[PDB]
Design a protein around this ligand. Sequence first.
Ligand code: HEC
Length: 108
Amino acid sequence: TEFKAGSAKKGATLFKTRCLQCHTVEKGGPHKVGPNLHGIFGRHSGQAEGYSYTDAIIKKNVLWDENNMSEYLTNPKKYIPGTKMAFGGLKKEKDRNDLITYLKKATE
Ligand code: HEC
């Protein structure tokens, strides 16, 4: 236990301001700069079809849980060196909590 529940509402707005540029979350949403995140929870990394992921993410083969995602979100390139994901990261654990709270919900 190193992830506690946040604000889905707060979560949804962070997504909009920090993730939307590159990703969609809805089932049936298109891949953009980053892949569509529908159903990411429980899936391994690099497995969405029709998306050209880097060697690195695929090979990293991470099982996406609220906790994994948390460390990833902190500093992506640090987590998976070689990832084409160009996001500095979210240093506050509270932003991270709210975003994942949103994500758990909207990608289901
Ligand atoms: C564009 C400038 C991006 C922003 C802002 C965010 N992400 Fe991203 N993401 C992007 C790319 C190009 C990729 C693929 C990387 C690669 O090496 O192929 C990713 C990947 C992800 C993943 C891993 C997905 C998988 O299918 O395993 C996740 C979980 C993810 N991105 C989430 C995410 C969130 C929540 C963001 C906002 C905080 C976000 N990313 C920003 C491009 C971009």
